[PDB]
Amino acid sequence: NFRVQPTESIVR
Amino acid sequence: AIPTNFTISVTTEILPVSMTKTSVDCTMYICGDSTECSNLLLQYGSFCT
């Protein structure tokens, strides 16, 4: 399937 | 006994032909957005294939 890799990372 | 009168009757019949086709991706059903899961499932790639 069309898998999109994460670009950035956020922490809340 | 000899029949003298007859009656014409039409009946119906319901019989399936095919079914809905579905596909199941092993890597997406077991893992999805992980790397260690894929690395551990690579050893079980024969079952998914």
Most B CBs within 10 A among A2, A3, A5, hence the mutation to make, goes to A3
In the block, residue with structure tokens 């077991």: B30
Chain A residue with Cα closest to B23: A1
Q: How far apart are CA B34 and CA A12, in angstroms?
A: 21
Looking at the complex, report in whole angstroms how far the Cα of residue B9 sits from the nearest Cα belonging to chain A. 54
- State the resolution, in angstroms: 6.8
Which technique was used to obtain these atomic coordinates? cryo-EM
Start-to-end Cα distance in chain A:
30
Query: Which two structure tokens, joined as six digits, stand for B33?
Result: 């957005």
Which residues have C-beta within 8 Å of that of residue A1, sequence separation ≥ 6? B25, B28
Reported as type and span, the H/E element at residue B45 is: helix B45-48
DSSP labels, A1-12: ------------
